[PDB]
Ligand binder design. Structure first.
Ligand code: CLA
Ligand code: CLA
Ligand code: CLA
Ligand code: CLA
Ligand code: CLA
Ligand code: CLA
Ligand code: CLA
Ligand code: CLA
Ligand code: CLA
Ligand SMILES: CC1=C(/C=C/C(C)=C/C=C/C(C)=C\C=C\C=C(C)\C=C\C=C(C)\C=C\C2=C(C)CCCC2(C)C)C(C)(C)CCC1
Ligand code: SF4
Lengths: 143, 154, 43, 95, 69, 159, 33, 100, 80
């Protein structure tokens, strides 16, 4: 309750002559991970679907295929072009889930306001053997 | 005469192998003049073969029905030249290799970056050690008694 | 030169020197003492 | 809006966004003659229950296969003609 | 305590941690985090790297034992 | 004219001359695979007839008994068998892909953006009608190819 | 008939039992409850 | 437009870098913590695009490497022509080449 | 899908998450180390299993740890 989602509007998309690494039927029945970024100038970048695109001066919008595509793109953006980015997840029903910072801050700065999960308060050798959790849903690492 | 094997000094098929190889090398000898380099080399190989067969005869090797020397490893005193004396001759050299290598690795172990001495072999150090493996059967025995051969876990 | 000898002491150069010397040794032994299957001295 | 200048994320029209398009699926009416269409309808409505179609297909096809292979003679397949040749005696007598 | 809690800086130490690369191997303590809330303060520096080309790792006080030398 | 599909560059396809052209798109749009408006039974009839002839082709002349007098008859019989199997696999496809009564999974949109009606072929009863048409048309095309090989053997090649 | 039983059972087994089995198993694969 | 742009004494002829293996790379010019290092010493040996970033040094390296390759091929042809000269039957093969 | 777990040996160097290409991880505050931060794995549904996180964990064996488990369309990394 400190950072609200951004709710990407109908922004323009980058100039691109079209490729074959784009959105297949996965988008037509599942999510397709829109990404939004804001360019200082009309520059040219490698698309994660192969090929070169020309980002527009101002906000852009790309609906590529999946999470790793937009996050690889955004990492290349932030490192090479020094640009803030945020990407989403667009289910076919209509909902738009905000995902990349989920706090307004990238997931490297340990900013308070995030609860620690996937957290085993022990060294990695002190997990029990499988026989101790035989015939139980907990495999080895959830106690 | 053990293991059903006749000696090669009194074997028929062994002499037959000899005659067959000699006729094979002589068939390749009637194509050159008897004084040129090929014929001289063929005659040298012929004498090499004949002395080879006669030496395998005179050492008491055992030639089976196929007519080839079958080495005896069991430990028969007559056949220690087959395995046991060259086996000791091997193990002496092999332990030389191992012992000079081990004493070298222990020598460089007290270095700042020892791995560079395994790449860039310290030839003075090894050469001072290279003859220290001459006495490996006694130095290693003492290092085993003193406890310096095998390392301790800590 | 110190560095030339440092390179001659490197593992491949010293390995090929050592194995060329060794190979010449075994070669000349198998020419002077060819065709050897049994150790006949004190046999 | 999907028709704006380089806008392809109409969040309302998710079909145009995700690529849901009948790329060649013409909605043009039946170009066939009505009478032959009714003929085929009445003569292929038996093959309307996919389960009954499958049972009929499997059972009748297996029956026809067994019938063909059982009534066919050796003239159409040599395996049923038989040897029509004396048998060769194998190695070492016959063993 | 404000005085040191763990081994001395430079004390060659053994690792009792069964999952580490240097298990039953000696080390060289380069630092000990004197904060009395961290779980693995003992920063050791070994001589030979692990499979990840790393020669240093944090260890606990009970997962470490100094040698008689 | 290789601009992307519907001018959408992030969809994995392009409107090249082969896909989206006045001739080839028209041809792919006026044949029984893409007649989304007409019922699937006539579509399947057309499809089965065409593939029955196409299968009787390489069974009479190419086969185990092509040189015999049983070439045409037994080849057409094998073609009818392959047709029965194709209707079989089509049937399990219609059973496995969509169950009984769901709406059509086909796109309800076109290139021009019209919210067209969904293709009822992709439904259960629709695909079943298509399979029935395919079986009927295929057996009929097999026997008609046999008839044409019987009564009109001379214009066609024997070799 | 005993010489004609392989001619009934081999085309039965090696073609229909694959039809029945592979079809029913593809249906068992593509199922939902 | 075109010219003979060429700079003198850029690199020193010295065995100092022979003594330090893996000098060409940063991670390799610090020592063999592992054995993989030696495999990386040969793997990256001629990966001049990874040693430097400027194309000038890479071009010089590959130019002189081509010269080494041509030296090797001239030495190889030396061997072939020599072995033909001394250890061959070419002087006899000309007489009856269809049977010798 | 996959079960990513972060153990208490973490030094909080932020390499696990700066290497992770699918936003699975995130650093949170903690009191067990000098850096006062530890990695967490909320978005394990987005975990493909590439183990770039644990190819960048500089500890005795590991602190982050990926367990291969029920593979879905997004853990299998499918654009279709
Ligand atoms: C591991 C399996 C194996 C074994 C056991 C052998 C064994 C042998 N091979 Mg075969 N061979 C092998 C693999 C093997 N070979 C392979 C893989 C190949 C293909 C590369 C060959 C190809 C091959 C050929 C082509 C020939 C042999 C020959 C020989 C014989 C060598 C005798 C000789 O000259 O040594 C004599 C001893 C030495 C060379 C070592 C001398 C060591 C020095 C002097 C140090 C010792 C002295 C030291 C100071 C200590 C003294 C005591 C005191 C000071 C303490 C021997 C029977 C030759 C032969 O005669 O066949 C019968 C032969 O012509 N081999
Ligand atoms: C032996 C292979 C074979 C053959 C000869 C045919 C032949 C035919 N099919 Mg069938 N079909 C086949 C396999 C085959 N099909 C398979 C495996 C499927 C399942 C996907 C279908 C599904 C299908 C449908 C749904 C329809 C047809 C239709 C047709 C007819 C015209 C359209 C056409 O094929 O061109 C179109 C060709 C293509 C789209 C392929 C383009 C790829 C490249 C560019 C061509 C390369 C060819 C080159 C020589 C190599 C024609 C009689 C139509 C029909 O029956 O109308 C009466 C129709 O509606 N086919
Ligand atoms: C192995 C390939 C092959 C073979 C041997 C045949 C063989 C035959 N075809 Mg088929 N045919 C084939 C492939 C083949 N076809 C393909 C790929 C097509 C296009 C889809 C056709 C389309 C076709 C038509 C349209 C017709 C034939 C017909 C025929 C027959 C006479 C042709 C004169 C002959 C049995 C003719 C016929 O009536 O068969 C009896 C006929 O009308 N064929
Ligand atoms: C293991 C069991 C098995 C059996 C019993 C058969 C039986 C047969 N195969 Mg073989 N086949 C098999 C497995 C089998 N196949 C497999 C695994 C493969 C892939 C490697 C093939 C590939 C193969 C080829 C490529 C060909 C055959 C052919 C044939 C036929 C013999 C040719 C002949 O001289 O008669 C001549 C007989 C005829 C021309 C009449 C055919 C009878 C039809 C098919 C019966 C129709 C019944 C029904 C409607 C459809 C089947 C129902 C389904 C439930 C099984 C015969 C029907 C040849 C053939 O004729 O096929 C066209 C041929 O060309 N087979
Ligand atoms: C696991 C044991 C076993 C195996 C591997 C075989 C293997 C075979 N049998 Mg035999 N068979 C068996 C048990 C077995 N049989 C038993 C127990 C019976 C009595 C019910 C038969 C009765 C039988 C007949 C009547 C025929 C075969 C035939 C065959 C052949 C083709 C497959 C077929 O259609 O079988 C069908 C078998 C069954 C449905 C019985 C399954 C139980 C094949 C060599 C055929 C043949 O002779 O081809 C050369 C054939 O016509 N089998
Ligand atoms: C002999 C005199 C000599 C000396 C002392 C040097 C000294 C130096 N050179 Mg120069 N160089 C020379 C001759 C010489 N070079 C020649 C003749 C050529 C032309 C080929 C070059 C081309 C050259 C280039 C292109 C580069 C150097 C570089 C270097 C430096 C590092 C070289 C090193 O450590 O690798 C030592 C490597 C070796 C000892 C072996 C190299 C392989 C040789 C050339 C051929 C192998 C033939 C062999 C038979 C083939 C293998 C088959 C076998 C299995 C049978 C060092 C300052 C490098 C440098 O300064 O960059 C920072 C660099 O990039 N040199
Ligand atoms: C004009 C020819 C030419 C040139 C100039 C190059 C140059 C280069 N190649 Mg390319 N390459 C070539 C031909 C060529 N290659 C061919 C013909 C192939 C097909 C196999 C390749 C496949 C290839 C791959 C797949 C890779 C390169 C790489 C490289 C670079 C570094 C190679 C290196 O450092 O290894 C130095 C030399 C060695 C490590 C020795 C190789 C040992 C060989 C395999 C020994 C066995 C072969 C021998 C004939 C058999 C006798 C055995 C006997 C000794 C017992 C360098 C830029 C690499 C690169 O750029 O990495 C980023 C890389 O990954 N090349
Ligand atoms: C007529 C002029 C001429 C000639 C004959 C050559 C010939 C050659 N060049 Mg090229 N080159 C030239 C002009 C010329 N070049 C110019 C103007 C430039 C600058 C743009 C280059 C830039 C260039 C590069 C960058 C490379 C070459 C390479 C090569 C060799 C390719 C391998 C081959 O086929 O070997 C066949 C072998 C022979 C024909 C043996 C010829 C031996 C003579 C003495 C050397 C060639 C004459 C030379 C240019 C004269 C320079 C003066 C010198 C005597 C002081 C080959 C020797 C490549 C190579 O192998 O690198 C070594 C290479 O990497 N050259
Ligand atoms: C590709 C190059 C090449 C290759 C593969 C060979 C290969 C060979 N040469 Mg040749 N040679 C070459 C170039 C080459 N030579 C050149 C350039 C010269 C001129 C100097 C010679 C001059 C030469 C002579 C004079 C002799 C050989 C001999 C030999 C053989 C044994 C050499 C040996 O073990 O030396 C010993 C190993 C080291 C020094 C290491 C071998 C078949 C010998 C031969 O054939 O014996 C009958 C021999 O007597 N070579
Ligand atoms: C007589 C004989 C025989 C037999 C024999 C036997 C049976 C033996 C056994 C033996 C044994 C049973 C042994 C054991 C051993 C053990 C151990 C445990 C050891 C150890 C050792 C060590 C540890 C060493 C080391 C080293 C060296 C010294 C060398 C080099 C270096 C090194 C360091 C490596 C026969 C008849 C066949 C033939 C003839 C001869
Ligand atoms: S890489 Fe490992 S040690 Fe570094 S922050 Fe992530 S979990 Fe902690």
């Amino acid at each position: 309750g400190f950072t609200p989602p951004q709710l990407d509007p109908n922004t323009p998309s980058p100039i691109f002559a079209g490729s074959t690494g784009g959105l297949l039927r996965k988008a037509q029945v599942e999510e397709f991970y829109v990404i939004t970024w804001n360019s200082p100038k009309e520059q040219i970048f490698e698309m994660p679907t192969g090929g070169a695109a020309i980002m527009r001066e101002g906000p852009n919008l790309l609906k590529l295929a999946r999470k790793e595509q937009c996050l690889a793109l955004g990492t290349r953006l932030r490192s090479k072009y020094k640009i803030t980015y945020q990407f989403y997840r667009v289910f076919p029903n209509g909902e738009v889930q905000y995902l990349h910072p989920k706090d307004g801050v990238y997931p490297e700065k340990a900013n308070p306001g995030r609860e620690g999960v996937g957290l085993n308060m022990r060294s990695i050798g002190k997990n029990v053997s499988p026989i101790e959790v035989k015939f139980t849903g907990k495999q080895s690492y959830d106690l | 005469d053990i293991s059903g094997l006749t000696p090669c000094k009194d074997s028929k098929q062994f002499a037959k192998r000899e005659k067959q190889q000699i006729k094979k090398l002589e068939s390749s000898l009637k194509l050159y003049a008897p004084e040129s380099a090929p014929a001289l080399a063929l005659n040298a190989q012929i004498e090499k073969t004949k002395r080879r067969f006669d030496n395998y005869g005179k050492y008491g090797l055992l030639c089976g029905s196929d007519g080839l020397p079958h080495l005896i490893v069991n430990g028969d005193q007559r056949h220690w030249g087959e395995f046991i004396t060259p086996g000791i001759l091997f193990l002496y050299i092999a332990g030389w290799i191992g012992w000079v290598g081990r004493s070298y690795l222990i020598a460089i172990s007290g270095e700042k970056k020892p791995a560079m001495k395994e790449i860039i072999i310290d030839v003075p150090l090894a050469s001072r050690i290279i003859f220290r493996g001459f006495i490996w059967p006694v130095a290693a025995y003492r290092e085993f008694l003193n406890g310096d051969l095998i390392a301790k876990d800590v | 030169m110190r560095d030339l000898k440092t390179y001659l002491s490197v593992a491949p150069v010293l390995s090929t020197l050592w194995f060329g010397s060794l190979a010449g040794l075994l070669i000349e032994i198998n020419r002077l003492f060819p065709d050897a299957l049994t150790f006949p001295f004190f046999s | 809006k999907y028709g704006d200048k380089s806008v392809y994320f109409d969040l309302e029209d998710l079909g145009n966004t995700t690529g849901q398009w009948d790329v060649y699926g013409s909605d043009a009416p039946s170009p066939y003659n009505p009478l032959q269409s009714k003929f085929f309808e009445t003569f292929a409505a038996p093959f309307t229950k996919r389960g009954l179609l499958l049972k009929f297909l499997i059972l009748g096809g297996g029956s026809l296969l067994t019938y063909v292979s059982a009534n066919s003679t050796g003239d159409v397949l040599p395996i049923k003609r038989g040897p029509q040749e004396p048998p060769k005696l194998g190695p070492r007598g016959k063993l | 305590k404000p005085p040191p809690i763990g081994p001395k800086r430079g004390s060659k130490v053994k690792i009792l941690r069964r999952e580490s690369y240097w298990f039953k191997n000696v080390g060289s303590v380069v630092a000990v985090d004197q904060d009395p809330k961290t779980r693995y303060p003992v920063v050791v520096r070994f001589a030979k790297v692990n499979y990840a080309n790393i020669s240093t790792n944090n260890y606990a006080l009970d997962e470490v034992e100094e040698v008689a030398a | 004219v290789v601009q992307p599909i519907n001018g959408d560059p992030f969809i994995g396809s392009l409107e090249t001359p082969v896909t989206s052209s006045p001739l080839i798109a028209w041809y792919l749009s006026n044949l029984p695979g893409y007649r989304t408006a007409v019922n699937p039974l006539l579509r399947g009839v057309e499809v089965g007839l065409a593939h029955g002839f196409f299968l009787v082709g390489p069974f009479v002349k190419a086969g185990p008994l092509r040189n015999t007098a049983y070439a045409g008859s037994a080849g057409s019989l094998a073609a009818a068998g392959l047709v029965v199997i194709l209707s079989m696999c089509l049937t399990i496809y219609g059973i496995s892909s969509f169950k009984e009564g769901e709406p059509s999974i086909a796109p309800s949109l076109t290139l021009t953006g019209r919210k067209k009606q969904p293709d009822q072929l992709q439904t259960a009863d629709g695909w079943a009608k298509f399979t029935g048409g395919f079986f009927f048309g295929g057996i009929s095309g097999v026997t008609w190819a046999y008839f044409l090989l019987y009564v009109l053997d001379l214009p066609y090649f024997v070799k | 008939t005993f010489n004609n039983l392989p001619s009934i059972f081999v085309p039965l087994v090696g073609l229909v039992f694959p039809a029945i089995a592979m079809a029913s198993l593809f249906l068992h694969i593509q199922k939902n409850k | 437009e075109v010219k003979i742009l060429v700079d003198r004494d850029p690199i020193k002829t010295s065995f100092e870098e022979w003594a330090k293996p893996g000098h060409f790379s940063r991670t390799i010019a610090k020592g063999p913590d592992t054995t993989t290092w030696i495999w990386n010493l040969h793997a990256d040996a001629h990966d001049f695009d990874s040693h430097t970033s400027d194309l000038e040094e890479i071009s010089r390296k590959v130019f002189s490497a081509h010269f080494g390759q041509l030296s090797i091929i001239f030495l190889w042809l030396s061997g072939m022509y020599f072995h033909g000269a001394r250890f061959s039957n070419y002087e006899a093969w000309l007489s009856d080449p269809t049977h010798i | 899908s996959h079960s990513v777990k972060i153990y208490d040996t973490c030094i909080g160097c932020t390499q696990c998450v700066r290497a992770c290409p699918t936003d699975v991880l995130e650093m949170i505050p903690w009191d067990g180390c000098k850096a006062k931060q530890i990695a967490s794995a909320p978005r394990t549904e987005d975990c493909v299993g590439c183990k770039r996180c644990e190819s960048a964990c500089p500890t005795d064996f590991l602190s982050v740890r990926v367990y291969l488990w029920h593979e879905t369309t997004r853990s299998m990394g499918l654009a279709y």
